[PDB]
Amino acid sequence: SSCRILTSDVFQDCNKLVDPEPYLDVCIYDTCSCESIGDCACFCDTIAAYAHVCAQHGKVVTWRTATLCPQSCEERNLMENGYECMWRYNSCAPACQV
Amino acid sequence: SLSCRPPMVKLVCPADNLRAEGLECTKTCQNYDLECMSMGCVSGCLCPPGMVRHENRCVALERCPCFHQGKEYAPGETVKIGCNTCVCQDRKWNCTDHVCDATCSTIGMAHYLTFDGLKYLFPGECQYVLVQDYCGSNPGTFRILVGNKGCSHPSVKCKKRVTILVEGGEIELFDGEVNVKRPMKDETHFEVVESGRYIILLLGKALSVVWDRHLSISVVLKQTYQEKVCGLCGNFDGIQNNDLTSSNLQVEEDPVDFGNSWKVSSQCADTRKVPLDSSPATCHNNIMKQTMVDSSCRILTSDVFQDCNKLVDPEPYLDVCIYDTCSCESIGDCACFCDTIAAYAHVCAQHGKVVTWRTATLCPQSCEERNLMENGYECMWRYNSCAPACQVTCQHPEPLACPVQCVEGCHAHCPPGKILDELLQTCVDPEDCPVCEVAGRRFASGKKVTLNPSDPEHCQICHCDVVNLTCEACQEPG
Amino acid sequence: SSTARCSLFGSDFVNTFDGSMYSFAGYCSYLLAGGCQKRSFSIIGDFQNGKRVSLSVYLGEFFDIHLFVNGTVTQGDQRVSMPYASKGLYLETEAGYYKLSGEAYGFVARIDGSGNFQVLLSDRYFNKTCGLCGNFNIFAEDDFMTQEGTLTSDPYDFANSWALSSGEQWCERASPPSSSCNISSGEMQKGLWEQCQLLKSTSVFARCHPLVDPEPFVALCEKTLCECAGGLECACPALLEYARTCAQEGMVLYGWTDHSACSPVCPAGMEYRQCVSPCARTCQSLHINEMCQERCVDGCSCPEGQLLDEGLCVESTECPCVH
Amino acid sequence: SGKRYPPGTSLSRDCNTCICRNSQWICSNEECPGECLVTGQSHFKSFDNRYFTFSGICQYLLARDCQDHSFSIVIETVQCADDRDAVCTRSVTVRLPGLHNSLVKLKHGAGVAMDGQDVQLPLLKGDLRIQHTVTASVRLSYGEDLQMDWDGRGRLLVKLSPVYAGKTCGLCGNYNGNQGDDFLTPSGLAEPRVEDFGNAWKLHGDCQDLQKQHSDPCALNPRMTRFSEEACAVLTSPTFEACHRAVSPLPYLRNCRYDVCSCSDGRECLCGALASYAAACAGRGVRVAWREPGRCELNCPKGQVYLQCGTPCNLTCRSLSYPDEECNEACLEGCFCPPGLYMDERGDCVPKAQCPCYYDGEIFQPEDIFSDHHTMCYCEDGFMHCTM
Numbered sequence A: 001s002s003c004r005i006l007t008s009d010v011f012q013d014c015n016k017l018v019d020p021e022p023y024l025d026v027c028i029y030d031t032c033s034c035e036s037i038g039d040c041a042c043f044c045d046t047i048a049a050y051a052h053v054c055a056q057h058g059k060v061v062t063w064r065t066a067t068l069c070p071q072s073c074e075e076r077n078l079m080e081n082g083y084e085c086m087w088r089y090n091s092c093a094p095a096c097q098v
Numbered sequence B: 001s002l003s004c005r006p007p008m009v010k011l012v013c014p015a016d017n018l019r020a021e022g023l024e025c026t027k028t029c030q031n032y033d034l035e036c037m038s039m040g041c042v043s044g045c046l047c048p049p050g051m052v053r054h055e056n057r058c059v060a061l062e063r064c065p066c067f068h069q070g071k072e073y074a075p076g077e078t079v080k081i082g083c084n085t086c087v088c089q090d091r092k093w094n095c096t097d098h099v100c101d102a103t104c105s106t107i108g109m110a111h112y113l114t115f116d117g118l119k120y121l122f123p124g125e126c127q128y129v130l131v132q133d134y135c136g137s138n139p140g141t142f143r144i145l146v147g148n149k150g151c152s153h154p155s156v157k158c159k160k161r162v163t164i165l166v167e168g169g170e171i172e173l174f175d176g177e178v179n180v181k182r183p184m185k186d187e188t189h190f191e192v193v194e195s196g197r198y199i200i201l202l203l204g205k206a207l208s209v210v211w212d213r214h215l216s217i218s219v220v221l222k223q224t225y226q227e228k229v230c231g232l233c234g235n236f237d238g239i240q241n242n243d244l245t246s247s248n249l250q251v252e253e254d255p256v257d258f259g260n261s262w263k264v265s266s267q268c269a270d271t272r273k274v275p276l277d278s279s280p281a282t283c284h285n286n287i288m289k290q291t292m293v294d295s296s297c298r299i300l301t302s303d304v305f306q307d308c309n310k311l312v313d314p315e316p317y318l319d320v321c322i323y324d325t326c327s328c329e330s331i332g333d334c335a336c337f338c339d340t341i342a343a344y345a346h347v348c349a350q351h352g353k354v355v356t357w358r359t360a361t362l363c364p365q366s367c368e369e370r371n372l373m374e375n376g377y378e379c380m381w382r383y384n385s386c387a388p389a390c391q392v393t394c395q396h397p398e399p400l401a402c403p404v405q406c407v408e409g410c411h412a413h414c415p416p417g418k419i420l421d422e423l424l425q426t427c428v429d430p431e432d433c434p435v436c437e438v439a440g441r442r443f444a445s446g447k448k449v450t451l452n453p454s455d456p457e458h459c460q461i462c463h464c465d466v467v468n469l470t471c472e473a474c475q476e477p478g
Numbered sequence C: 001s002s003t004a005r006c007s008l009f010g011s012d013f014v015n016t017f018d019g020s021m022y023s024f025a026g027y028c029s030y031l032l033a034g035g036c037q038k039r040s041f042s043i044i045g046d047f048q049n050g051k052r053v054s055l056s057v058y059l060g061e062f063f064d065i066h067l068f069v070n071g072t073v074t075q076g077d078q079r080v081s082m083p084y085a086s087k088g089l090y091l092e093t094e095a096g097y098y099k100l101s102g103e104a105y106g107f108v109a110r111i112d113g114s115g116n117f118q119v120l121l122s123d124r125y126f127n128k129t130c131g132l133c134g135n136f137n138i139f140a141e142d143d144f145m146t147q148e149g150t151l152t153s154d155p156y157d158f159a160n161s162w163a164l165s166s167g168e169q170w171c172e173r174a175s176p177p178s179s180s181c182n183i184s185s186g187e188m189q190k191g192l193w194e195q196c197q198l199l200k201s202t203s204v205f206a207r208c209h210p211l212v213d214p215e216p217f218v219a220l221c222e223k224t225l226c227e228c229a230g231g232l233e234c235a236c237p238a239l240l241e242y243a244r245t246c247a248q249e250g251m252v253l254y255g256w257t258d259h260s261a262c263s264p265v266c267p268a269g270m271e272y273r274q275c276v277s278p279c280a281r282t283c284q285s286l287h288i289n290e291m292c293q294e295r296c297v298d299g300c301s302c303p304e305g306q307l308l309d310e311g312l313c314v315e316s317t318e319c320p321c322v323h
Numbered sequence D: 001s002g003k004r005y006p007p008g009t010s011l012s013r014d015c016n017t018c019i020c021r022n023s024q025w026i027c028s029n030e031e032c033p034g035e036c037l038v039t040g041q042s043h044f045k046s047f048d049n050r051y052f053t054f055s056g057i058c059q060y061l062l063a064r065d066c067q068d069h070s071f072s073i074v075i076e077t078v079q080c081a082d083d084r085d086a087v088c089t090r091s092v093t094v095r096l097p098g099l100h101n102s103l104v105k106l107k108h109g110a111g112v113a114m115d116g117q118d119v120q121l122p123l124l125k126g127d128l129r130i131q132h133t134v135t136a137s138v139r140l141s142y143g144e145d146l147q148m149d150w151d152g153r154g155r156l157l158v159k160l161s162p163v164y165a166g167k168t169c170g171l172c173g174n175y176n177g178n179q180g181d182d183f184l185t186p187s188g189l190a191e192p193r194v195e196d197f198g199n200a201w202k203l204h205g206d207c208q209d210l211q212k213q214h215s216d217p218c219a220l221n222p223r224m225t226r227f228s229e230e231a232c233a234v235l236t237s238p239t240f241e242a243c244h245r246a247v248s249p250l251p252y253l254r255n256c257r258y259d260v261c262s263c264s265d266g267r268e269c270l271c272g273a274l275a276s277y278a279a280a281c282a283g284r285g286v287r288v289a290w291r292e293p294g295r296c297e298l299n300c301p302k303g304q305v306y307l308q309c310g311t312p313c314n315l316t317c318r319s320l321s322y323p324d325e326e327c328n329e330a331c332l333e334g335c336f337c338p339p340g341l342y343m344d345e346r347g348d349c350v351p352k353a354q355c356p357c358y359y360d361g362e363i364f365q366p367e368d369i370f371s372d373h374h375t376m377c378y379c380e381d382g383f384m385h386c387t388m
């Protein structure tokens, strides 16, 4: 069931282009073997490997919430005593930049 | 030979007195009140009768320290244990006798911490009495309950249901939010503070509740009762072994039979006596996985907790870490692990020891989704380590009785002259609050309460919905 | 340096990380090395009756391997095949001699054909690992710090402090052996004194002296040349150690076995080279280079051609395929 | 305890009684005697039924009367095997200011020493009685408000009656019921870190106070990790099914794995920890039959036989010399021999035909006619028949 996020309402655009049946069988193969305890990374990493491939075909996705693989970015806006907070986790930003 | 130092004297066993309590009975500060063995003295050198030894220094007077946490304390030096101070007035600290505010807890899915302090195991599935007052020969004011579903084996399942019955009311909570089913008469003491992860929840002068939105239930009582309650958390008497006094008024030994007495539905399922073993279902005969959980549960003994390891024994909170995550099949949400350490971190904070143990590879807890509705990104919200729970708002401008000092969670911070409102996720100036000040006196932001029920003739009512400078008329009885 | 070395060579003899030898005829398991404040691992050695059997690595609490001259390695109680690589412990064979690597956990063990336990260990445990191969410090006199922590003058009761027992067998204080050499003295000390002496006389050994001292090595041999009857080969075990001890210090020696009249045992097809590369180009191999910049290691290997294929040397023409 | 009882019944805890009326057991609150305990390596029990551990090596206090000074007990701890996490008890000292201000010393055997002098058992002075129990364990008894038990291989016990309610101070606690305050240093404050409590009751300043009490010495001996699991897994096996509903087994399991990994020989360390559990199961009423040829059945000599629950009143030959004396003793466990045979001094047990007399201490043989001028006395079959 939890690997059926690869067939969820938010992926419905990418389900049409990129077959999820490959990336699904890995989700069930790893996390059976993997004893995820503190880091649920042997699950959270397989969907990002599907989300990225969805993005390369021009389909951004925001599937990542607070109960599900949070990925904060707040530790970086910390050294400066002032808190400008210019860092952000967002969907899919240009991999290349200057 | 060696002619020993001036301040102390060489002693010699006499041939007549068997009581040659000489070098063998070397009185230091530890052993002075204590009693010592001695067969015969030796060829040593020894402090006078009214003087002792102290870390290779024969300290002159009876002013030597009063050890706590294996650390020095000069006479008159003070310490703070709980809510009490205590000073070694001589060689012995004499402490005050202001009994402190006790605190239940539900660490993880199936464990319970009593008031006097007693971790025990109780996997149940029916609805259970966490605590109440209707116990033997008393009125029966409040009847907090708890109800679990699919929680005999801890897992991503086990959503709790909490139904609390005070002042003839019925307010209950599950699935993230609170729900009122029957408002109670005296709305004045009612109060709800959704600060951070928690739902702090007052109900009177001597009662409070906390809820981490996921499983934890930590009811907090005051000095008032002192053996007026019973239930799962016990009697709140100071005596710790009488927290297994079942509903039929006797002490048991096997807590699985204890909670079975306290269930509400007396025809639902009594839980099953499990064969005891140090490995739960999954970890049973899977020694490999046990050591990856064992190690990862040793964060409770890590470099960052070293301050709190001294005060609060982690051996209780450890055994839960290994019990849950064996049973729990954490897949997407590692919350059956991340929640047990926060239940240790909070208790460390209540003793004044803030901790920041939460990093990006380990239970991240972002707060960024909230700074989203506004097209502008002011981002005033932050995951502050342990911030105060009782702050000022447009909804609750006044300072509240504050049972909890600080809490982890996402907290707002913008420059001063801007006070928070929860409906509009951003902070805002004071005047934008729907605040109420009718006929001068300072009070809340227009509570929905009918003041002055006492006196008919003095029935001079003044409500205020949001801002209105209004005063209603009282309906006469005649 | 950045490394260490222990060795249990011949019969009952020991060489700690710091130039301190003695003899010990144990009776059960004993702790070779491992932490003392906290143990992520523990190398263990079992003695049947004085003579040694097995090396064992217990990796904390959960995993266990029990290699030995028998070579029939096992994991727990289930005998596994070889090689084997679970839990970050490659269990291999190098130069015809068996190896156990733990580079994540910072150690490399091995055994030879005769049976001579060796333990290479990083510099990370300097002033840490306290056990039967002693601490990894600079000094060599203070490396008897018991399981209590007590500098002892006896090299014997020390090794008995570091005993460890099982449910399968509980073990006791072994006894020192009553030497029968004391009566059967005869000629054996006059004719055979030379094989211990040639560590000092021959030129091929006459150059590690600024790096090491043979005075203990010659001291430990003269007590073991007396029990074996009719053989000069009884000296080459104590001598064979002295070769490697100088090699580890950064100064290797060459061809010393040419005239020594003792070569260490190896299976058919191979004999004892010195400083052969560990990355032995074998038959069913991919022709890749300049990744094996590892240090040079002693051990027996094939002739110039005659590539390896399944524990034997075979000519390059007869390289098979596989399916 | 998960079973029903009709109304009007009266079950009895060890402490007191309780009666069912209207689904509500009524109960008394009268005090009942406490039991400090030392055993194994370093595992303590307070009077208030607390458990803890403190592996210190010095002369520590164990108990003391603290408003007056009727007595004072002093333990002495030493390392006891190769590991550092193995600190067993060697000897305990007892002190009675009420009688000579003497100084008794229980030694690492079954021996005792008053003021340096070794002593044969029994030792009837005025108040305190010291005698063997199974002929393998000493039992002091001062007055009627104090007992003890053997400190040979370290299983010291005590028995304090409620006359000492709350008026003692030591490692064993206040004897006040409250399980929490028991970490109260002599300087009068409850300490949370046990490593501060035990070292606060040491007697010699030169002794090193420790800094950390380790909980898993099986790390320093990974070989015993397996064996410590299956071995004390019988503690929860239904062999002890009868006293899971008498006393919590979880610590008696926790204190096994610290002993079997730590001590020199895990055989008897195992089979001196299981008995620690059965002995407390029996102290509440439940006896268990947990002995096997594998699970450490003791070897009673050829004269004696193994026995589960028996009467140590009609065993010793001294009993027939002083039959009038009361034996208000329990149904104990140990090595006895059949009723036709009574115990001799020399390890065998014998019929009452050659059972000697102990008149005035004097060990007379089975036929010794015996008289001064004015009396007339003889030993017949164990009893001393005097006349005038």
Ligand SMILES: *[C@@H]1O[C@H](CO)[C@@H](O)[C@H](O)[C@H]1NC(C)=O
Pocket: A090, A091, A092, A093, A094, B372
């Ligand atoms: C998220 O990122 C996208 C792509 O860069 C950008 O168009 C959008 O404005 C961002 N939204 C938020 C809420 O930051």
Ligand SMILES: *[C@@H]1O[C@H](CO)[C@@H](O)[C@H](O)[C@H]1NC(C)=O
Pocket: B089, B094, B095, B096, B097
């Ligand atoms: C502690 O003792 C001091 C000195 O006798 C006394 O002044 C003080 O009132 C005492 N405080 C408490 C809390 O008992």
Ligand SMILES: *[C@@H]1O[C@H](CO)[C@@H](O)[C@H](O)[C@H]1NC(C)=O
Pocket: B384, B385, B386, B387, B388, B411, B412, B413
């Ligand atoms: C946030 O936490 C920091 C570090 O503890 C503290 O300095 C600051 O006052 C906190 N701010 C708020 C708004 O709680």
Ligand SMILES: *[C@@H]1O[C@H](CO)[C@@H](O)[C@H](O)[C@H]1NC(C)=O
Pocket: B464, B465, B466, B467, B468, B469, B470, B471, B472
């Ligand atoms: C204030 O209360 C009056 C009733 O007296 C009501 O008519 C008015 O709409 C209220 N104003 C606000 C702003 O709520």
Ligand SMILES: *[C@@H]1O[C@H](CO)[C@@H](O)[C@H](O)[C@H]1NC(C)=O
Pocket: C070, C072
């Ligand atoms: C040694 O190996 C042989 C062959 O596998 C086996 O039969 C024998 O039992 C082994 N003995 C030992 C000491 O393990």
Ligand SMILES: *[C@@H]1O[C@H](CO)[C@@H](O)[C@H](O)[C@H]1NC(C)=O
Pocket: C127
């Ligand atoms: C080695 O460790 C000991 C014990 O902790 C310490 O006393 C000593 O200073 C250390 N020496 C070195 C060279 O680090």
Ligand SMILES: [Ca+2]
Pocket: A058
């Ligand atoms: Ca495009």
Ligand SMILES: [Ca+2]
Pocket: B116, B234, B235, B236, B237, B238, B239, B240, B241, B242, B243
């Ligand atoms: Ca209680």
Ligand SMILES: [Ca+2]
Pocket: B352
């Ligand atoms: Ca404070």
Ligand SMILES: [Ca+2]
Pocket: C016, C017, C018, C134, C135, C136, C137, C138, C139, C140, C141, C142, C143
């Ligand atoms: Ca050394």
Ligand SMILES: [Ca+2]
Pocket: D048, D173, D174, D175, D176, D177, D178, D179, D180, D181, D182
């Ligand atoms: Ca107490």
